[PDB]
Amino acid sequence: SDKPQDFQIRVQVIEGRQLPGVNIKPVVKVTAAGQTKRTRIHKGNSPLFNETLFFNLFDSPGELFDEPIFITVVDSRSLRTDALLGEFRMDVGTIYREPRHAYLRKWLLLSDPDDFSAGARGYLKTSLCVLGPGDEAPLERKDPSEDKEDIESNLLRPTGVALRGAHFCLKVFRAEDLPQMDDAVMDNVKQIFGFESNKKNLVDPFVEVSFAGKMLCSKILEKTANPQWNQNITLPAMFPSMCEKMRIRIIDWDRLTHNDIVATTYLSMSKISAPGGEIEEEPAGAVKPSKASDLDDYLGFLPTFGPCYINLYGSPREFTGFPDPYTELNTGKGEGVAYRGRLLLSLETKLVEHSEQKVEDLPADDILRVEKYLRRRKYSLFAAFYSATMLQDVDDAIQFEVSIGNYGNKFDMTCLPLASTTQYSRAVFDGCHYYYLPWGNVKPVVVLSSYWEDISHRIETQNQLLGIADRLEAGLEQVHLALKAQCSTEDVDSLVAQLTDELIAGCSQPLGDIHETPSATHLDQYLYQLRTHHLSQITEAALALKLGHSELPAALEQAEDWLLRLRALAEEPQNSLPDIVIWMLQGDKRVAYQRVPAHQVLFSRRGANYCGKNCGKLQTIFLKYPMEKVPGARMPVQIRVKLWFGLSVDEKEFNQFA
Amino acid sequence: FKIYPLPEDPAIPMPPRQFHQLAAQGPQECLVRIYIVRAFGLQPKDPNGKCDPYIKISIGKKSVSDQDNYIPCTLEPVFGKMFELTCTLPLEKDLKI
Amino acid sequence: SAGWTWAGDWFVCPEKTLLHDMDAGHLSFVEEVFENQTRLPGGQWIYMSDNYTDVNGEKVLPKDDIECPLGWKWEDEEWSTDLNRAVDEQGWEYSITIPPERKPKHWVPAEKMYYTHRRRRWVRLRRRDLSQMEALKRHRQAEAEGEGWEYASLFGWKFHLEYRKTDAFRRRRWRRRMEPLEKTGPAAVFALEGALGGVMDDKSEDSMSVSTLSFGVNRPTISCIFDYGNRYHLRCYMYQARDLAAMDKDSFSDPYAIVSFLHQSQKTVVVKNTLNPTWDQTLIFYEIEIFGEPATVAEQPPSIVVELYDHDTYGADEFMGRCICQPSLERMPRLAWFPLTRGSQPSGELLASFELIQREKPAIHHIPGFEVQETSRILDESEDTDLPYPPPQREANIYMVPQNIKPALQRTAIEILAWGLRNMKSYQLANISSPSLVVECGGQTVQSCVIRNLRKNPNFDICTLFMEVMLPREELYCPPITV
Amino acid sequence: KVIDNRQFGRRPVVGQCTIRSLESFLCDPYSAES
């Protein structure tokens, strides 16, 4: 209009998603009013900002249009060439004129504003309010469940209309070892007709997918214990997705009561895709033979997943006719406290310019080629309990129960070869405020064998990459020990050289061939070539840092970045292993729990450097109360344990860890 | 700040004050003479491709400028200008030229 | 079982063991007694002398029947009502009528007419003689005591811990212990897993779905047992804490720390009315042991948890947070600052050092089962005579930090010339008009005059600030000076 | 078969040729410098 006003434009820089590069270190900064300022620089694979910046512009409603905030995302690192990851140059006049004079929970597409059909390079989550002298908008919403949709959830300055999506075809075959959730009332009703009571009140299970603001549902089964579907449900979403992770939240039908969820899980989209490319231009070290971090075979791909078993978790497996006080565990909130079923499916992705929803019936070929991927092996788990202290409010004798997936649960069994539980004992007062268990020289042990598919050909890689990360992490502590000693830079370089010798030595550790496995898919072809690609990448980073010399801050950045990758490269989305969950009980009442991955105690005959860091080592663990976030003023218990895990063929090797 | 060790022996006399100042605490107004000689190598600040420099001084709560006393479109302009400005200290001690 | 043999013969294994050394390495201990009283729902409170219980509801003797253990002396000649707990003004907790379960779970510090049971806590402090802990080894050699027999009129039910003339039957629990065959080693435990699930054959009165692989218990338990431990000598040096959050409404605290260990807990001297409390205290711990082979045990020390509490008239209910520290083999451990965290919320730091000196002589223990112990020999190396100089005392049996660990001290004078303040911005254009000059460090403070209008005069009428304190001459032991 | 430099790791064919006139380009390679 013709009436200039002091408009305060508030823009918040919140977080990035699905961006190219590794351990990227973007900074967003805008100057104004003759002042010089700097903003915090945020580093990580998926960097967070959480910073608000604003400016006061004395323009009319039709003039503030031409004075946008010059948001840029500049990636600045000391070990490699800096880059612009995208910038935003849209007008701010449209937002003021529109109702509320603001947008909430929207993302900015990151790209070159004047590059037509460039494609997204990831998205930046922001909020924007334009506050005139007579206007207010201090209230904002960032609810993460609302901006999942990739359509009209963002602002497009680059590629104003040129978005490209994909069709994600989910081939869902079957589920096994499901918990009973069917309303227990049927147990009392069926008796009216002379039917026997039971604990097998079967639900009416079906396949449901909810992602990117859209949901699909197909054929519903009834009163079924071990459901088979063979259905292909395709959900459209953006190829450069605005979601970092996909949620699996399936609501089973219940013929007796309201439909509900047996279990939930999440799958990271950063583990099965590379929309920003698989190759970063970050060849740390003195060698850059491909003008890229290393030589890749794929250099980017659509999200994809081979046939694999999905481990779902939620509230306790015990069947009841009462409302579940921990229902949220089955709604995708936090993490579950019990294993609640195994689900197998695969993903095929098509790249398209349009979104569509379709359901297809699978051919026999998709079933037979998947059924032949089914295999089972005997696994060996050992755990010893050395001590337990800092107990509070102990009313009765304490027992713990630990199980793997659906195996070792004392309430789901009548007879098992070994206990998952131990003898009940009373806690003893410490003379001040706490009680402890009088175990003395007796250190309780649990040994269990779960049965599941053989993925050891991928596991060795995980411990290989972690083992390298662990040896490199030690490099950081040693230089800091020298730093407090007021050592010279030359002394730091000496430590770097010593570290480098170990860093390159670890690069001699051979990679497993994962193409031999009959269940291997194109994703495993991706994993193998990416693993050889990144294995050479660390090999290239090695040695070169010994040849040169640097101040400590540079040496620290090198290890920190490589450590992020070495750990990230140990990631495997195809996890067919159920975790280990331990509960502390008072009598038979649950008090506190913890969830343990077995890969850190896992052993392989291939070598010590293919073993988990805690394999055969003493560990200190803590349990947390139901729906606990912090230990607070008092935590359940502090326990000292030793764990070992491996294949039954590794039995002979356990002894060195005993 | 002066931080120093003393002997634990109680027979040792205490140290004197290390520093003293004139109690010029109040509004010690001072006359400021700004001598502007010349400038060179100045960048263009707008689409016209030219720059027409002048000095604006923020002194405390007051603003001083001579925007209409300049030489247009000159690469290395000579000023030779003097500003007779008042200043109350330490209230207007912050002079941004 | 497959891959396994018997470790020894059958031994008596009571359902619970009540024989424990609760004084092991303890110099101080606080005892408590639970006095219960009951009433009719339509009546008033009555007292019974046999209504004293433990935390588990078990019968115990009256508070006045408790005698001093050997090597100890009472600090409290009589039991006092414990008002340092969540109890009412009379020291009682109250509960609703107890059901046939006879196991009250609901207790509050309030009396209600529908409450028919109440419990009072008594508090009595005891401290050890500053001499020897030999009394602990003389009476605690046994892992467990008693024949394990319980008496009943009929076997299988209604058992009692005391004999009655009607008790025609007695019962005691026996346990067996297995050891892995050396042909497979400890790994033999996996020769049982997945194997014994198919092993069971009942052709007699002994009939169980879990027979052979286990008896009595639905599933056979497993454990590692040691006949020895690795002994250590521990000393905790608590010098000073800084920047502690206040828990009291009056912005002060009366902090004391509890040194939390696997089977030990000791209380430090409480420091009153300060958020930068100085202890200069040492706590001495004896017979600290870690189980396992010394070759790897020495490299894997336990975490030590230091829990600070703000003392108050109702007890130190306002827990200030816990700190994690580690000892070394240094004979005079260097002090360092460690964080105190409550609920994952850091609340300050403590300057302290700790030692865990390796003892050559192992702790001696017995493995359950009728076997000859592997640790048939004892290495009689000095128990505590090769230790570094022990701390000086400030009070009877109250130790200070050794001067060898303490920093050498200096008198420090901090002379500040506070000319004026700048960059005072606009705090309501009023509350920054008369800022004060105050200096605090280590609980020591400097006060000065306040000028009503420093907006037109940023300088002070009085610019003198002076502090004189004793500081550490050692930078590591000398905290950043605060202002 | 001619391949484009496509983004996201793809290597599509831009186009190809079919030459049935290949005999028409026959020449003597050693009639020149070699």
mmCIF file of C-alpha atoms in Angstrom, chain C residues 10 32 92 97 113 150 254 276 295 306 317 330 337 347-348 365 391:
data_model
loop_
_atom_site.group_PDB
_atom_site.id
_atom_site.type_symbol
_atom_site.label_atom_id
_atom_site.label_comp_id
_atom_site.label_asym_id
_atom_site.label_seq_id
_atom_site.Cartn_x
_atom_site.Cartn_y
_atom_site.Cartn_z
ATOM 1 C CA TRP C 10 25.047 -81.295 47.119
ATOM 2 C CA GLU C 32 17.025 -47.530 61.266
ATOM 3 C CA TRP C 92 4.858 -41.854 61.514
ATOM 4 C CA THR C 97 -6.393 -51.223 56.230
ATOM 5 C CA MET C 113 -9.512 -42.167 59.945
ATOM 6 C CA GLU C 150 12.178 -75.132 58.578
ATOM 7 C CA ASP C 254 23.908 -27.250 53.680
ATOM 8 C CA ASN C 276 30.962 -23.051 47.605
ATOM 9 C CA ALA C 295 45.368 -59.027 34.615
ATOM 10 C CA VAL C 306 29.356 -39.124 44.652
ATOM 11 C CA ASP C 317 15.437 -34.477 50.656
ATOM 12 C CA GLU C 330 48.923 -42.372 42.384
ATOM 13 C CA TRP C 337 37.070 -30.667 39.094
ATOM 14 C CA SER C 347 24.365 -28.444 39.076
ATOM 15 C CA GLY C 348 28.001 -27.570 39.867
ATOM 16 C CA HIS C 365 35.925 -66.277 49.234
ATOM 17 C CA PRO C 391 45.754 -37.799 56.390
#
